[PDB]
Amino acid sequence: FRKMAFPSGKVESCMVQVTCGTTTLNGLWLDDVVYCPRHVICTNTDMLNPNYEDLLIRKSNHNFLVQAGNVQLRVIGHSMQNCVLKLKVDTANPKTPKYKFVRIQPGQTFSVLACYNGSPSGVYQCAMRPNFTIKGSFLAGSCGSVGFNIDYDCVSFCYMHHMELPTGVHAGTDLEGNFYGPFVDRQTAQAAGTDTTITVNVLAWLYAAVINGDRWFLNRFTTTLNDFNLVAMKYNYEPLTQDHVDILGPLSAQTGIAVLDMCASLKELLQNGMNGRTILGSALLEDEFTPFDVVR
Amino acid sequence: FRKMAFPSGKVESCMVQVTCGTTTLNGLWLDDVVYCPRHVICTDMLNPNYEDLLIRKSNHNFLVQAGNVQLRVIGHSMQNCVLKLKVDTANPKTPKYKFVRIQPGQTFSVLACYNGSPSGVYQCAMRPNFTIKGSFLAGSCGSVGFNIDYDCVSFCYMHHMELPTGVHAGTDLEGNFYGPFVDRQTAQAAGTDTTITVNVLAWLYAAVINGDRWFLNRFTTTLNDFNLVAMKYNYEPLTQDHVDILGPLSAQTGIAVLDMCASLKELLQNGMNGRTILGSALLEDEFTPFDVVR
Ligand SMILES: *C(=O)[C@H](C[C@@H]1CCNC1=O)NC(=O)[C@H](CC1CCCCC1)NC(=O)c1cc2ccccc2[nH]1
Ligand SMILES: *C(=O)[C@H](C[C@@H]1CCNC1=O)NC(=O)[C@H](CC1CCCCC1)NC(=O)c1cc2ccccc2[nH]1
């Protein structure tokens, strides 16, 4: 069991470089529109309290240099949607995949294609934390990189990168420019909320462990949802909702370990620790695989 | 800090499906050649005579499909443990590529594929015992490992089999196995593995370059004394080449290699006492000095 990213070729073909004055970052080219963070129109002067409408009315089409590899794309229109800028260009991307813009929920995973200067550099799997940040790996110029899932030839874009918080975790928007989490595109003091562990993902990961031959943590017991939730609250774990139990249904049946039976295992893991042992290859309870991620 | 794979698009455009008899696996289509594991021609698995198995095949016994398109095989030959199927059509999306043979400790991306269609991408390392700790299911054979550098894809691994311990064995793209393995279903066992010491040190440098110094100390060590200690924890010996390779990261952080060796010695002695390094509760050994810089 390894953390696995989706194959990224369909998205690589959509990445372009956007330059506005002094700032260069990445854009997502789909049909005849390039999408990118609206903060690309900020200078050092504006970054602390921008008036994005004002700054945008100032700009004209030729203020944006869009580069698809060696080819410059001519901007013929510009617009803002929430915190994303939409640059209408000369030419529709001839490799636009089947795609959707989707908004994901905390606890869900996606692949990140990290890009610099419009050129894809690396790909890795992320989870939307319960505090709406991303534990990413993003350097200067990574803004505009996207997160996505693929479902049978259809790419669902869910994330575009905007910022790094002082703790080193990351914040961005969906592709309609709506931020994940209580963050703003302003150079002001911002902090992530206290994070919590994604309980249903930990359980799915334990089921993944049983499937792969590590069963030392299983026991004979079972808990209640109410009793397990008091434990989860003590250890900063997301409450296990009744719907969470249902999505684990397939894994309980394949292994014969009922969810509250596996919760009894997790309950004890939260106190005995691992007693010097390892679960999959990890000395920590891993919470960035969804039930779907384990089954696939 | 993440285990990052290379973008897989250039390799996705090369994956095809090869069927021989009742067996389907993946092939790598570059120009007018499809490369795949020669054991696609087995029915036979304990003591195959591949020379005899192959002379009985004709071109039409190999069904090659690139997506919906069937590729006509016009010839075939065997190069060590890989089959080279000459096809009627050159891959129009062949990238700039090379075939490279890697040494233990080297990392690469794996594009896991099934029925010629890519399924996922992840980072991997060649273990000191010439296995890889992959994630491969039935039908993954022919999946390839690669690095990409300046739009040039360097293919270094093709998947052949799973050992009884659950680790994986395969060949370079000229069909020479990594390690003492053969394409037979006989009893073969990965030798005892070790931790890639040079990679653990690179990663501790990465920890320093980011924010963390809590594991440093005031000691140094000789290279010989470090190796005498580290081998008691099943670490690979550190060589002068490894010390040289770490020079750039040493000079960038101000921490002499042997001073970082002293810190590693103490980390092995003490554990991390409830802390993490980068993101991990264990000493990570699948990042190379090169991976850290990039
Ligand atoms: C876009 O490419 C970068 C990506 C950052 C750079 C470093 N690591 C990343 O992920 N985005 C930024 O640099 C933003 C730009 C701002 C423009 C105006 C609106 C808000 C975003 N800045 C930051 O991410 C930033 C500034 C800052 C200051 C002090 C501590 C942390 C910190 N992070
Ligand atoms: C190719 O697709 C598969 C990949 C395997 C399947 C499961 N996980 C993998 O990586 N390759 C095989 O199944 C090989 C078949 C050839 C191997 C040698 C030459 C002829 C056939 N077999 C194994 O990987 C295998 C069989 C086996 C039996 C008992 C213990 C371990 C074991 N591994």
From Swiss-Prot, chain B:
<protein>
    <recommendedName>
        <fullName>3C-like proteinase nsp5</fullName>
    </recommendedName>
</protein>
<feature type="topological domain" description="Cytoplasmic">
    <location>
        <begin position="1"/>
        <end position="294"/>
    </location>
</feature>
<comment type="function">
    <text>Cleaves the C-terminus of replicase polyprotein at 11 sites. Recognizes substrates containing the core sequence [ILMVF]-Q-|-[SGACN]. Cleaves and inactivates human TRMT1, preventing tRNA guanine(26)-dimethylation of tRNAs. May cleave human NLRP1 in lung epithelial cells, thereby activating the NLRP1 inflammasome pathway. May cleave human GSDMD, triggering alternative GSDME-mediated epithelial cell death upon activation of the NLRP1 inflammasome, which may enhance the release interleukins 1B, 6, 16 and 18. Also able to bind an ADP-ribose-1''-phosphate (ADRP).</text>
</comment>
<feature type="cross-link" description="Glycyl lysine isopeptide (Lys-Gly) (interchain with G-Cter in ubiquitin)">
    <location>
        <position position="3"/>
    </location>
</feature>
<feature type="cross-link" description="Glycyl lysine isopeptide (Lys-Gly) (interchain with G-Cter in ubiquitin)">
    <location>
        <position position="86"/>
    </location>
</feature>
<feature type="active site" description="Nucleophile; for 3CL-PRO activity">
    <location>
        <position position="141"/>
    </location>
</feature>
<feature type="active site" description="For 3CL-PRO activity">
    <location>
        <position position="39"/>
    </location>
</feature>
<feature type="domain" description="Peptidase C30">
    <location>
        <begin position="1"/>
        <end position="294"/>
    </location>
</feature>
<comment type="subunit">
    <text>3CL-PRO exists as monomer and homodimer. Only the homodimer shows catalytic activity. Interacts with host FBXO22; this interaction promotes the proteasomal degradation of nsp5.</text>
</comment>
